[PDB]
Amino acid sequence: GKAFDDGAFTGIREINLSYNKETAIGDFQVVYDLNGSPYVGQNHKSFITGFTPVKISLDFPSEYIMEVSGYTGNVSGYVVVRSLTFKTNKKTYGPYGVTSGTPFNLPIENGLIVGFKGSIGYWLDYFSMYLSL
Amino acid sequence: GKAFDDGAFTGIREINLSYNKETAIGDFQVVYDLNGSPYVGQNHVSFITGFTPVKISLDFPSEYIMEVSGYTGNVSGYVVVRSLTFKTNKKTYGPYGVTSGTPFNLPIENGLIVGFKGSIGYWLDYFSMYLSL
Amino acid sequence: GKAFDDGAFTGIREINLSYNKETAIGDFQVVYDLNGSPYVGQNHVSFITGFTPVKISLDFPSEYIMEVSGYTGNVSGYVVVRSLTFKTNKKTYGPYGVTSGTPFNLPIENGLIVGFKGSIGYWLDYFSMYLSL
């Protein structure tokens, strides 16, 4: 897939992703906070279409992600991220996608997610997160 | 003066300031690096004119600031930043302004300056720097 | 179980743990680095015995942990850490224990594990990790 790296910012304001209940996560785009001002990250899109859009608008800065969880698994012979769930200090968003395969979860006791990087072909191949205080 | 706060970024690419050799530092603007792309900071201008412009173009990312020094003192009744000098791992830029008064210097053994904040009226009243690894 | 919190250090030199092929992880102790000097962390022992001891001696500072993975599951009505695997830039240590239950994994692209906190009763109930550059 096509790799992307948004880099690190000062916070997260909104997450826009798309999924398909039969395959995996498709598109991924984030609106970051950049020193008090919104910063729209590039839209990382799937090579194909047919995904269901989802908009996660956080009540920045009082609301922030405390845990990210999901599932990875095989789809069409590739290992990809099939589902994602975002838990904030106020609400749980998701799961979005297919909750099948191998689970993973990243609970954060102290710190904040301030950026994303990964790769997307037909679906989200993999992703990493920038963490900071 | 009018307070400003650029916030924190990934690094510094260029510094544009103006000064008067008989008074103090005037305008101050920074072109930051934001995850590999240039980010033009807001131009913080003096309330008056008559300053000499200076453009400090760094060979980012191989060149970076290792020490910032200068002098503070009175201009009329106000305490302001009279002079500034920027020393990188390649060259020394400055001094710019009146090199008299109370000196100050910030040598950095490990780390990077990634942002500026301060206040400017007729002249640069004061300033602080964001530091990061 | 009895909670513990080693705190954060400069790095990790050695990990001493014990496990049982039929239950879960028992004892846990870490020899940290504290500014170039080994610092022996408190030995956090299980309330019971019958575990198999394991000593993971890292070639500090050239060798460091890049990923920690394991399984959590129910043992005698208690949710505990049943298995652990430590992957460094040089080798993979483990899995130690039983790989049954819900898996978890923490891969690190940039940064270091510099401390542990958790709780141990008959077995390791839960644990968290301190991360730093």
Partner: peptide, 18 residues
């Protein structure tokens, strides 16, 4: 060093990269 700031990065989860 280099003139680029760094931060802790955890992951990746999904396809293997290393």
């Amino acid at each position: 060093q280099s003139g680029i700031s760094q931060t802790v990065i955890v992951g990746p989860w999904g396809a293997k990269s290393s």
